[PDB]
C-alpha cells in the first residue's frame, strides 16, 4: 500500500480549509504506518486552515521532524516565514538551496522564496534565479505553471510575459487569472484577433456561467465596435454567471443605450448604482 | 404580378374623388383625420366634415 | 387604413406590405433564384454573333 | 536575459425553419441551464424542456400543443426571462374576454403585468403589457417609444388567422415588427 | 456632449472631453430609426398621426 497513500497525501495537501484538513486527518488516519516524515506534510495541509490546526500541526512536525527531514524541515520553516515576517525566509533560502541540490525540488524553495521577494526584494538572483531554475525545471503537471505566472507579474521583458500567461492558462485552465492577464496585456499590444480567438475558446468551454472574465471581455470588444446585439447577448450571458459585478451592469446600460432603449438602460443603470452607491457615473448617467 | 395591385389603384382612385388624397399620394387633412380611426373611417369622417 | 398609414411615410410603398404578404407566399418563395437566374442568363444572351 | 529566453521559448513552442424532434434529443436540463429562472409545481415535459432550452438562447419557437395550460408554461418563463433582463415584453391575445383572467394570472403569479384595451389602462407602465392586436396594430403604425424594448411578442392563438374578418390583423403586425423583437 | 473618456484596460474614467454629435437633424416626424429623439414629451401610447 504505496499509491493510495501518496494519493491521499496529495490530496490532502492540496485539498480546502478546516473541513478538508479533517479530511487530511483521517487519509493521516488511514495510513498511519511507519515512514512518520511524512507526516510533517501533513502538517502542510493543516495550515490550509491556520486556525487550530497549525498549532496540532505544530505538535506533529515537531515529532515528525526528527533524523533529518531536509524537504520537509525547509518546507516547515518557509512556512514559518510565511507565517511571519520574511526575516526567516532569508536565513532558511540559503540553507535549502545549499543542502537540496535539484531543479524541480529545487522549483518548490524558489516558488517560496519568490512569495517572499514578491513583496519588496528586487531578487535579481534570488528569486528570478530561482524563478530561472523553476522554469527550466517545467513540471509537467501544475508545478511550473504558477511559477512562471507570478515570474512575469507586472514587468521584466512583457513579450515573454505574454507567453508564459498564455501558457500558464492553457495547461492550467480552471484558474481565471493567467488568461486575463494574457489577454489584457495583448489587447495593450497593437494586435487584436489573438485575442478574440482565446476569448472564443475560453468561451466555447463554459458550461454554465463562472466563466464572467471571458463573457465580459468579449462583451466590450463587440461594444467598441458598433455591433450592438452581440454585446448584448454577451453581456446578458455574463450577468447570469454572477449577478452582483457593478462593472456589468455598468457595460450593460451602455450597450442598451447605445441603441434605441431608453427605460431598460435606465433600469439597468440604477440598479447598478443601487449597489456600491459610490460610483458617481452611474447616478449622473440615470 | 402582384394580384391586387389593380384593387389597389381603384382604392387609391375613390380615396383621390373625395378630398383625401391630391394628386401624387400625398395625404390631405381629411386623410389624417380619417387614418386614426376605429371603423367605419369613410363614413365617420364624411359625416364630421359635413 | 392600411393605404391611408402607408401613403402617409414616405420611405415605404403599400406594394412592399403585398409582397410581403402569405397569399403571395408561393409566388414569391424562391425570389433569389429567379433573380440569380436572370442576371445568369443576361450573361448568355450576349453571345450569338450579329 | 539570453539563456532564459530560449528555455522558455523551447517550452512555449439555406433552410430558414428547423423541424426540431418532439420527444427525442433532451436529455440533459440541468447540466446546462442550472439556474431557471421560473420554477413550477411540477415537472416540465419534454417538448417543454426543449421550447425552453430554445427560449435561453433567443430563438423563436412556434410551439404547436394541445391543451391550453401547457403552452402557458413556456408562455410565462419567457416572461420570468423578460422580467430578469430588464426588458419589456407583449402579451397579446385575440378574444377581448379571453385577455382579463390572463391579467388576473399574470399579476397574481409575478410582480407588475399591465393591460391595455379600447378604454382600460392599468399601469401603462408595467413589463407585461397584455393587448388585442387591433391595438398592437395601431400603437406599429405610429412609433409609441414602447417598441424601442421590446424582447418577445407572445402571439397566443395564431390559428385565427384563418378567420376572414380578422386575419389581415396577423398579417399586418407580423410584418412591421422590427428586427430586434423576437 | 462631454463624453467620458476611458483607460484601455480596467477601463476608469480618466476625464471628460467634448466630442461631436452625429445624429442631429433628425426627428421623430421624419426619419424611421432607432437614433432619432424620443418624442414630445409624455403622450398618448397609440392613435398619433404625425
Same mark, same amino acid.
Given at each position: ?160 510575459? &505574454? ?76 450577468? &447570469? ?46 | ?50 | ?50 | 536575459? @539570453?539563456? @532564459? ?74 416572461? @420570468? ?102 | ?50
Amino acid at each position: 500500500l504505496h499509491l493510495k497513500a501518496e494519493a491521499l497525501i496529495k490530496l490532502s495537501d492540496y485539498d480546502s480549509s478546516e473541513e478538508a484538513i479533517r479530511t487530511l486527518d483521517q487519509i493521516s488516519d488511514a495510513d498511519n504506518i511507519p515512514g512518520l516524515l511524512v507526516l510533517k506534510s501533513l502538517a502542510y495541509r493543516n495550515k490550509g486552515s491556520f486556525d487550530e490546526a497549525a498549532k496540532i500541526m505544530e505538535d506533529l512536525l515537531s515529532s515528525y521532524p526528527d533524523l533529518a527531514e531536509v524537504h520537509a524541515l525547509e518546507a516547515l520553516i518557509h512556512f514559518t516565514k510565511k507565517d511571519y515576517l520574511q526575516a526567516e525566509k532569508c536565513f532558511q533560502r540559503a540553507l535549502e538551496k545549499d543542502t537540496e541540490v535539484a531543479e524541480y525540488h529545487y522549483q518548490l524553495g524558489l516558488t517560496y522564496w519568490f512569495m517572499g521577494e514578491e513583496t519588496r526584494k528586487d531578487k535579481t538572483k534570488a528569486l528570478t534565479h530561482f524563478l530561472k531554475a523553476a522554469r527550466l525545471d517545467t513540471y509537467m503537471g501544475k508545478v511550473f505553471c504558477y511559477l512562471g505566472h507570478y515570474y512575469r507579474d507586472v514587468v521584466g521583458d512583457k513579450n515573454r510575459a &505574454r507567453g508564459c500567461y498564455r501558457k500558464a492558462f492553457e495547461l492550467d485552465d480552471t484558474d481565471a487569472e493567467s488568461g486575463a492577464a494574457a489577454v489584457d496585456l495583448s489587447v495593450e499590444l497593437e494586435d487584436m484577433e489573438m485575442a478574440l480567438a482565446i476569448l472564443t475558446t475560453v468561451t466555447q468551454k463554459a458550461s454554465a456561467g463562472t466563466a464572467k472574465w471571458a463573457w465580459l471581455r468579449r462583451g466590450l470588444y463587440y461594444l467598441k465596435a458598433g455591433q450592438h446585439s452581440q454585446a448584448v447577448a454577451d453581456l446578458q450571458a455574463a450577468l &447570469r454567471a454572477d449577478p452582483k459585478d457593478f462593472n456589468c451592469w455598468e457595460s450593460l446600460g451602455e450597450a442598451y443605450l447605445s441603441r434605441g432603449g431608453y427605460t431598460t438602460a435606465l433600469k439597468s443603470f440604477t440598479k447598478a448604482s443601487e449597489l456600491n452607491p459610490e460610483s458617481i457615473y452611474s447616478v449622473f448617467k440615470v | 404580378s402582384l394580384l391586387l395591385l389593380p384593387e389597389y389603384h381603384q382604392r387609391v382612385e375613390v380615396l383621390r374623388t373625395l378630398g383625401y388624397v391630391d394628386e401624387a399620394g400625398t395625404v390631405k387633412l381629411a386623410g389624417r383625420v380619417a387614418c386614426a380611426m376605429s371603423s367605419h373611417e369613410l363614413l365617420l369622417t364624411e359625416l364630421m366634415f359635413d | 387604413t392600411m393605404i391611408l398609414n402607408l401613403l402617409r411615410v414616405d420611405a415605404l410603398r403599400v406594394e412592399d406590405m403585398m409582397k410581403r404578404s402569405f397569399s403571395e407566399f408561393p409566388s414569391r418563395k424562391d425570389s433569389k433564384a429567379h433573380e440569380q437566374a436572370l442576371a445568369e442568363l443576361t450573361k448568355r444572351l450576349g453571345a450569338l454573333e450579329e | 536575459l @539570453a539563456r @532564459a529566453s530560449s528555455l522558455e521559448d523551447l517550452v512555449l513552442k439555406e433552410q430558414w425553419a428547423i423541424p426540431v424532434d418532439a420527444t427525442s434529443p433532451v436529455g440533459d436540463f440541468y447540466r446546462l441551464i442550472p439556474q431557471p429562472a421560473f420554477q413550477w409545481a411540477f415537472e416540465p415535459d419534454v417538448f417543454q424542456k426543449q421550447a425552453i432550452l430554445h427560449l435561453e438562447r433567443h430563438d423563436s419557437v412556434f410551439v404547436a400543443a394541445h391543451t391550453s395550460a401547457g403552452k402557458t408554461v413556456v408562455a410565462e418563463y419567457a416572461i @420570468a426571462l423578460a422580467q430578469k433582463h430588464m426588458t419589456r415584453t407583449i402579451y397579446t391575445s385575440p378574444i377581448k374576454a379571453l385577455s382579463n383572467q390572463k391579467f388576473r394570472d399574470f399579476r397574481n403569479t409575478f410582480g407588475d403585468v399591465g393591460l391595455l384595451t379600447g378604454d382600460v389602462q392599468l399601469h401603462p407602465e408595467a413589463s407585461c403589457l397584455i393587448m388585442t392586436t387591433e391595438i398592437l396594430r395601431s400603437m406599429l403604425y405610429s412609433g409609441s417609444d414602447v417598441i424601442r424594448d421590446l424582447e418577445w411578442v407572445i402571439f397566443d392563438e395564431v390559428h385565427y388567422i384563418n378567420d376572414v374578418e380578422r386575419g389581415v390583423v396577423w398579417e399586418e403586425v407580423l410584418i412591421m415588427l422590427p428586427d430586434h423583437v423576437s | 456632449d462631454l463624453q467620458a473618456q476611458r483607460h484601455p484596460t480596467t477601463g476608469q474614467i480618466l476625464g471628460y472631453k467634448e466630442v461631436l454629435l452625429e445624429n442631429t437633424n433628425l426627428s421623430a416626424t421624419t426619419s424611421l430609426s432607432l437614433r432619432r429623439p424620443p418624442g414630445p414629451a409624455s403622450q398618448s401610447l397609440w392613435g398619433n398621426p404625425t
